[PDB]
Write a protein that binds this ligand. Structure first.
Ligand SMILES: Nc1nc2c(ncn2[C@@H]2O[C@H](COP(=O)(O)OP(=O)(O)NP(=O)(O)O)[C@@H](O)[C@H]2O)c(=O)[nH]1
Ligand SMILES: [Ca+2]
Ligand SMILES: [Mg+2]
Ligand SMILES: [Mg+2]
Ligand SMILES: [Mg+2]
Length: 166
């Protein structure tokens, strides 16, 4: 069957692990354990196609971000995640995109910009700002909550549909 290699990147604490765990395991991780590099695999049907998702959950913490570029160059599509209540994580996005362009050696890499923690009221990044950033990259913007599950499937499946247009 078709395998899609997805990689989730973004600043420490924005909810990369929680998103992935909600998608694959259907529960919300409330605690914060910083990731080094973890892998998840799951067979799913997306738009009628049975396929295998291989998801790399990467470190956001600079202290844990060793050899991240190595694990990443194998990725086919990337979720670039920031948190809507963390302005710095949004500002950090451009540098994750640059890293991806480097590891893939291409300006045309399947990506989705994800604004996570949309269940939270302390918003400092407005939807329109994120829409504009995504538009400049030529990619979708989707808001998610790993807590409520809002947009979680949408984000990952959209990433798959982006790889498919590639
Ligand atoms: N309210 C809320 N909290 C969230 C959401 N996603 C993650 N969190 C919380 O934010 C914290 C960090 O989440 P985590 O998934 O560990 O972040 P990470 O990006 O994987 N961190 P790291 O880069 O260090 O591995 C946890 O306490 C988690 O419960 C969300 O959508 N809503
Ligand atoms: Ca929990
Ligand atoms: Mg993590
Ligand atoms: Mg390179
Ligand atoms: Mg503002």
């Amino acid at each position: 069957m078709t395998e899609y290699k997805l990689v989730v990147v973004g600043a420490g604490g924005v909810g990369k692990s929680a998103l992935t765990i909600q998608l694959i395991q259907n529960h919300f991780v409330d605690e914060y354990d910083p990731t080094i590099e973890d892998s998840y695999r799951k067979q799913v049907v997306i738009d009628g196609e049975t396929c295998l998702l291989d998801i790399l959950d990467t470190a956001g913490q600079e202290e844990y971000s060793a050899m991240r570029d190595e694990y990443m160059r194998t990725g086919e599509g990337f979720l670039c995640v920031f948190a809507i209540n963390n302005t710095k994580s949004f500002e950090d996005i451009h540098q994750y995109r640059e890293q991806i362009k480097r590891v893939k050696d291409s300006d045309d890499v399947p990506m989705v910009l994800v604004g996570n923690k949309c269940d939270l009221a302390a918003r400092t990044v407005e939807s329109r700002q994120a829409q504009d950033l995504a538009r400049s990259y030529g990619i979708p913007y989707i808001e998610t909550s790993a807590k409520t599950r809002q947009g979680v499937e949408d984000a990952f499946y959209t990433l798959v549909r982006e790889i498919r247009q590639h």
